[PDB]
C-alpha cells in the first residue's frame, strides 16, 4: 500500500510518454526511498531505467513496499489531460487496483485494474548536450541513413551519417551553446541505429540537459534528470 503525490501532472505524463515509446508495459517497484522501473524493449536492444526518489514528491508514504504492473499506453491516456500545475496522486490499497487522481480545477480519480509484469560499463567519453541537438541530429541523420556514428575527442563531439549519396555531420565544441560539457578519456567511436535514437529522443525536451556516455563499439548511455533528483536512463546497444 502507498499514497504518492507528484506536483506537475503534465511533466509526469511526459516522463511516462518518453518511456512508452520503447516499451509497452513495465513493473514499477515502490519502496520507501522512491519509485523505480526497469525494462528492455521488445527487440532487446534498449534498456530503460527510471528512478524517482521520494524527495521529488510532495507526499510519499509507503506502508509496505510493492511492485505493480503497468501498461504504459493505458497510463499515458489517463494522464493526457493532466495540466502543468495539476496535482497527481498515485494511491494503492490492499486490492489489485491503482487509484490515479489528477487534481486541479477539479478532482478526477481513475480506478484501473493492475496486471502483473515479469554490469557497469567503462565509458571513455561523456558529453552533456541540449535535447534540441540530439533531436535535430537524429532527424538530420535519418535523412541520409539508418545509422549514425558518434565520435568524441577533447573539446569535440561529432555525430555523422552517410547514405548512398548524401552525408551529414553534426559537430559541437564548447563554444557552441549546444554542448554544455565534455570529458573524454581518449578518442571514442561507436555507431548506433537512427530509429532507436529517434524513439529515445522523441519524448526528449528541447531545453533538457542530456548526458551521454559511451565507449568504442560499446553501448551508449543516455540520461536526463527530473526535478534534479529524478532520473530517466536509456542504455542502447551499438551497431558494431
Amino acid at each position: 500500500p502507498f499514497e504518492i503525490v507528484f506536483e506537475g501532472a503534465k511533466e509526469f505524463a511526459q516522463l511516462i510518454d518518453t518511456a512508452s515509446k520503447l516499451i509497452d508495459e513495465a513493473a514499477f517497484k515502490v519502496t520507501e526511498d522512491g519509485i523505480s522501473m526497469r525494462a528492455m524493449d521488445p527487440s532487446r536492444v534498449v534498456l530503460i531505467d527510471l528512478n524517482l526518489p521520494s524527495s521529488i514528491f510532495s507526499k510519499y508514504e509507503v506502508v509496505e513496499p510493492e511492485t505493480i504492473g503497468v501498461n504504459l499506453d493505458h497510463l499515458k491516456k489517463i494522464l493526457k489531460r493532466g495540466k502543468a500545475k495539476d496535482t497527481l496522486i498515485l494511491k494503492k490499497g490492499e486490492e489489485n487496483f491503482l487509484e490515479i487522481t489528477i487534481q486541479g480545477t477539479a478532482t478526477r480519480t481513475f480506478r484501473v485494474p493492475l496486471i502483473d509484469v515479469e554490469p557497469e560499463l567503462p565509458f571513455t567519453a561523456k558529453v552533456v548536450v541540449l535535447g534540441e541537438v540530439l533531436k535535430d541530429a537524429v532527424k538530420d541523420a535519418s535523412l541520409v541513413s539508418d545509422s549514425i556514428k558518434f565520435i568524441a575527442r577533447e573539446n569535440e563531439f561529432i555525430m555523422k551519417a552517410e547514405g548512398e549519396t548524401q552525408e551529414v555531420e553534426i559537430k559541437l565544441t564548447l563554444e557552441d551553446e549546444g554542448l554544455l560539457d565534455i570529458e573524454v578519456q581518449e578518442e571514442t567511436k561507436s555507431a548506433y541505429g537512427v530509429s532507436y535514437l529517434s524513439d529515445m529522443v522523441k519524448g526528449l525536451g528541447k531545453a533538457d540537459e542530456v548526458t551521454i556516455k559511451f565507449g568504442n563499439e560499446m553501448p551508449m548511455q543516455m540520461e536526463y534528470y527530473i526535478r534534479d533528483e529524478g532520473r530517466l536512463t536509456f542504455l542502447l546497444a551499438p551497431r558494431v
Partner: peptide, 8 residues
C-alpha cells in the same frame, strides 16, 4: 549489424 544488449 545491430548488436543486442545481450552482447554486453
Amino acid at each position: 549489424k545491430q548488436a543486442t544488449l545481450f552482447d554486453f
